[PDB]
């Protein structure tokens, strides 16, 4: 069949360590957006917020294009982890002993190389809970995502609005919003700007 | 099927002539492959003769051809060209093309081979 | 012997990344059914339900057929994880730090390619415990299973009735039923419907 | 030396996925016996029993025979995990988040292929603690071992009496016995009987 | 045993003739294999001559055979056929078949080889 | 040492005769190995001639030998036999045995090779 | 493109087990400096201090040099873990069950082989908390970093001043300083001196 | 350089599965000794003792010898885990859920093949805490080390005195000694004696 | 491109003469490569003739050349030299250079090959 | 460098004579290597002639040499010896030694090869 030819052909000359860009002097464009599912817990003795999230990263490969008229029937291909270049996007402020709680899944590609990656996770961020208005409070918590190695001139991260559409209402805390913002910062280690995306969850006490 | 590469322009010419070996391609996306020219003598093995990357400007020639032969490609007509000048008596062998997925032109993992052609000096 | 020839022949041209379907323009059919064994715990301060389960998935390969008259004696072959295509079926609403608690085991195949996969697990789902009728309550908890990458036009999941036949009665909570239902949903990320199977455990307080 | 020739010769034509039996239409014979070392804890709020155990499995390979007169000096060979076929024997009723707490070690073979495998572990079974005679009780706890994939017509498990000879007496609970029994059960998934071995620990309160 | 592939239809014919090389198979399930025809000259190496996938319609011919020869298969009689037309004085070599487990016809990991046959022009 | 395989029974015979090529083995456990007969022509490469698995009944012959030659083994005397009947003028080459650890007779990883023998027709 | 040629050329003759030095009779020079981000917790019943840190080490390879005029566009290359030699720098006094909580990331190299490695981590050190002045105390905690195998005559570690610039102030404890000092000690196991770097966090109670 | 030739040469014909002994009919000699660093905790409700230890085992390979006059500059080579034969020494009486808490590190070999292995770990032993003299007690805890597979006629373990020289005094419990003793025991599984080394920590309450 | 190695100094000389085969390099950093000289006879295969590591002092010669030929390198002019003395009648073959990334001179993974040259005795 | 293996003792002798082929070694620790003798005919490939393990007593000979030739080693003088007796007309070829790190004598991964020698009968 043709699905067995496609997989043998797409990986002829592929180096998982190379940025899949046509002109190697231009930055790739990754699209980032998270999707909340539930506010599992908000600890106050410590300062930690546990949530269920689905990350959404979308880029455009250039070495995984074929012709659906030559390979009839096949219109998408799924690549496991470790065989295709994937962005290294981490959570800067995390309180998990492992520092990374994402559960790796397959990367989905279509006839034009537009790759999609939606890892689920149970993320334990680090927030600041204020109880100076114990009866009523509008707490704001931050989630800061960004690329660790690639940054600036290489991987121009872009933000997409969050998707609160499967949210399951919590008991004590109620959501008020989850705005997002994109920033560019300079660090002491290197001399090239690094972008980042910050999402601000607003939970009001009931 | 229909992944066919057809060569043309062979023949015989005295020392110090000219040739315009050409190779047309069909059946695959010609803009995602880097053609390489190979030459085999009757009593020898395969040898490089030129190579061009898929981007368009990566020409790599051989040491003994560096100054004489010139390689070129045309994506609009799905063709490759190997202009040969100042031919010498030991440039007698079969010339054929070999494609390869996105690559530089230098050693790679070739996929689609071509047909033979005869050039005599 | 013939088992050593069978194992050397069955993996001549096999790509673990390929859907084992004959006509690559048709969807494969997977059969899903869970088997409960015990309700280990039902937390109420948090909202979590811990159970012991055996998943049951059955598909039909097409590249693992042989003739028992040519290979006498051999009537079944067992393949480990990472050498045969296995469906990626996850539990959507999980409260485990790893998000996947299944213990991978072998896949069993017979002379016609009918594969069986029964991973055991101790699953920690997320439920909603209501205590407005503390003396008597009929709590309903949900378990939602589905394919992550493959969905719609590719993997037509089907449901089979649960199997409460080795259940060990609990102390405080008693079972009343575990019905199942199959649904098809549209997500914002893609444009193709995704199926899912939901099992509803009904636990009544004693 | 000869120990370097033996290891290069024994693994010439070996497939770690093959049941090492001479006549592939007959069942292999495995010998199972556990060895207790200490009753580490007996939880009562929950229902769990933590113990320290050494499993003992013994089969007879057929592809690892040599002649000690041709390979002088070498009388035993030790194979790590993943290079020699090992039975997949699990604990059916486990309360550990991983479902398998065994620490894999080497398999020991002698000049006739009689393999020995003694994995140690700290097992957390699931028991039923009755406190209706709180002052005095004779609690019985069960440990059920069996093969997951291989069973019936393939791997005829056999039992050997437990070995309480290094037991370190506990403080509150005192042992009275650890009898064993072998049973043959039919499951709904398949149609071929599966054997199992059950050990009953009897702990009396002090 | 009994995994036997037997070819027939060889012989000698003048330039511009016809031939109906056939190959019967036995001992294995003929519907789970893709036959491929190979040709070897007395002083050369193996070369592709055709190929058909197990499904039934995946014919892949060679560049120097695209327009002349035609490959076909019959699952009911467990046979393969390679109709040869407009033979040239260069098509002189031993032709033999090679099966392979589920495959496309293009390069695979062949399992069962066949016996040689002689065709002269 | 002492892992020695010794051939015998070679010679010359006219077309349509008989032969009883034999091979004795020593130095290794003869009951844990599957002997395979190989034939090499003066101007060709190695080719299968027969094969028997260690169990005792797995005989695999070649396509062009299927009906003429018969292979057998004797564990009591540590010997292998290849009875040859209806010899043709093509069966002229060196025949030698090759053992292999527990195997089927078909392609394996051979360990102990044997010595050559001459058979002419 | 040239990024695919560079990755294929840089790893022609590379042995990840070799010290990347020109004259093998001279010591390599590694540069070490940590960066604090938050004092997550300071336990007192036990003696443990949990912090969020970014290690910073920077050596200079000699086998990863190229010419940016011959490979236009490519000015940096990122190598995953397991393919380029990385120093083995551990925390001598750790209280984590794994003894190493660093999250491995890529190593960044530029046109001259100057490598950078900045692993993040949530480190659990071991401190001595004194409460003889409960209202006011100036507790000092120590973090000792050093190479395990390489030491002396091989890897001349050097220290760089800490970087408290993204510090997020804590609630109860306030920072006063984090000085560093380099020492050279002799151990009983070997006879060659081993260097180490010690950082002293000075937390005052509020 | 020569460090690359040495690494390419030392692993020409090496089988990590073979005992590095010259005459395969004689036992190898391993030297064992632990080094304490701190008594992290002594639980009394349960029976567990947590310590910070450095193991020290030394053997003599015979296949890793070279000539420093032919390979000038190179006087030591470090091999990671999985490429050189290392003794399998475990702690018989462990209370850790994994049964092995050692953190694997490199093996350091010199010009004569004398290897050294010093894995650090946070070991959770199992003790018997007696409180019949609560004001003053001299508790004794045991740590039993030994080889799992290799034992007797193969690996003649030998003991070296412990090294309490970096000990950091604890608060409540004060050390009095850590004697060691070597014993040879017969087990029921096999018929060849197995050696072991037992260290007795003496902790007196303050 | 422009990764070119050009040899020179070939010719013919009677037994017991002298030669100064040289090879210039261009297109790559000459200080990160170890040149190795290879010799191929008309009816034989490739063979070592000498080798020098990138550092500068690692000369490894062959057993049959140990005392006659001497290899040297010049990083300032991007050249390699193979002085040949006391040539014998058996030293007739094509000599060409081969570079390799950081290496010792002994067997390695060569990257850039050179052009042939003819020396006759 | 200086890892040199030098052969000696070649020549010509009538059928049924004697020979004492010897091979001296230098440059490497001779007590950590197992020498193996290889023989190559003018129109054939390499073949085993003998082998001795590093320990001192592991001699493995070939099937066609088992009774005639005898291999030995001397660690004090860094030499190997292959006494040849009852030479026969087909024992004409180049004999050379090959070392290998700690090994048995049977197939290993050889490191240092030697020089050729001529023996004619
Ligand atoms: C494969 O996916 C791409 C990306 O979604 C499709 O191309 C367009 O992508 C843009 C976003 O960059 C969408 O806004 C368009 O709607 C997409 N075109 C569509 C949906 O027709 C592309 O069409 C997909 N399929 C193929 C065969 O290319
Ligand atoms: C192998 O398994 C298949 C699947 O169970 C058997 O084929 C039939 O499968 C259907 C379900 O799709 C069952 O309802 C039938 O009972 C099965 N046939 C039987 C049990 O005879 C198949 O028979 C099994 N064995 C072989 C040799 O094919
Ligand atoms: C190798 O182990 C086997 C198995 O223990 C030994 O063979 C006999 O095995 C039975 C159990 O099936 C024991 O009851 C016998 O005592 C064993 N024979 C003995 C101990 O002599 C075998 O002897 C062992 N060694 C060799 C060289 O075979
Ligand atoms: C690659 O990185 C190195 C190291 O940073 C740069 O070389 C100099 O390195 C020193 C530190 O050892 C700095 O103080 C200098 O500022 C660096 N030179 C600069 C920044 O020009 C080197 O320049 C970097 N880039 C290249 C192409 O070499
Ligand atoms: C390599 O290590 C060995 C082992 O330490 C050194 O050889 C001697 O080993 C014994 C212990 O078995 C020590 O008591 C001696 O002091 C060691 N000799 C010394 C230190 O000179 C050996 O010297 C070390 N180095 C070399 C080059 O062999
Ligand atoms: C890549 O981009 C550069 C500048 O952006 C341009 O000069 C060049 O032509 C582009 N294509 C290449 C380098 O192949
Ligand atoms: C895909 O193949 C068809 C038929 O071979 C061809 O007409 C079409 O142009 C190809 N696609 C593109 C983008 O050229
Ligand atoms: C596969 O299915 C399609 C439509 O369902 C049909 O046209 C085709 O003949 C089938 N077989 C193939 C494509 O081999
Ligand atoms: C299996 O083999 C037997 C004998 O070779 C044959 O009769 C039978 O038809 C084969 N199976 C099928 C499905 O054809
Ligand atoms: C294997 O066992 C079967 C029945 O148990 C018997 O018929 C056969 O002869 C035995 N040996 C084989 C199949 O080689
Ligand atoms: C082992 O070898 C010796 C000598 O080669 C032989 O006498 C003995 O019979 C062999 N073992 C068996 C079981 O035959
Ligand atoms: C390396 O250093 C030594 C002494 O430090 C010196 O003699 C030598 O020339 C240097 N270079 C080498 C060894 O290549
Ligand atoms: C890099 O290449 C350019 C052009 O090939 C050359 O001029 C330059 O000298 C090279 N770099 C170095 C350090 O020599
Ligand atoms: C090895 O030791 C045995 C006895 O200990 C001895 O007989 C033998 O000669 C030694 N050397 C060997 C076996 O090569
Ligand atoms: C090491 O090499 C030197 C010079 O090659 C030599 O003199 C010395 O003897 C060698 N070492 C040993 C132990 O022989
Ligand atoms: C971009 N990262 C964010 C903080 C560290 C920095 C970095 C820079 C270079 C290599 N790794 C990490
Ligand atoms: C919404 N989908 C189903 C769950 C995961 C998600 C998805 C979609 C496409 C590719 N990967 C994941
Ligand atoms: C009921 N069986 C025994 C326990 C697991 C289960 C099973 C059956 C077939 C294949 N895998 C698992
Ligand atoms: C340098 N390290 C510090 C403590 C252990 C010591 C060491 C020495 C040799 C090999 N491994 C570790
Ligand atoms: C020392 N080991 C642990 C206890 C038994 C012994 C052993 C014997 C055989 C195989 N593994 C382990």
Numbering used by the authors:
A (entry chain A), C (entry chain E), D (entry chain D), G (entry chain B), H (entry chain C): 1 to 206
B (entry chain F), E (entry chain J), F (entry chain I), I (entry chain G), J (entry chain H): 1 to 121
What does the paper say about this structure?
The human α7 nicotinic receptor is a pentameric channel mediating cellular and neuronal communication.
We quantified this by looking at structural hallmarks conserved in the family (loop C capping, cys-loop motion). Measurements of the Loop C capping (10 Å for the Cys189A-Tyr117E distance) and of the cys-loop outward motion (11 Å for the Cys127A-Ile168E distance) clearly show values that are characteristic of active/desensitized rather than resting conformation (Loop C capping around 10 Å vs 17 Å, cys-loop motion around 10 Å vs 8 Å, respectively). In the five orthosteric sites of C4-Nic, we found an additional density in which we could confidently build a nicotine molecule. The pyridine points upward and elicits contacts with loop C (disulfide bridge Cys189-Cys190) nand loop E (n+1 Leu118).
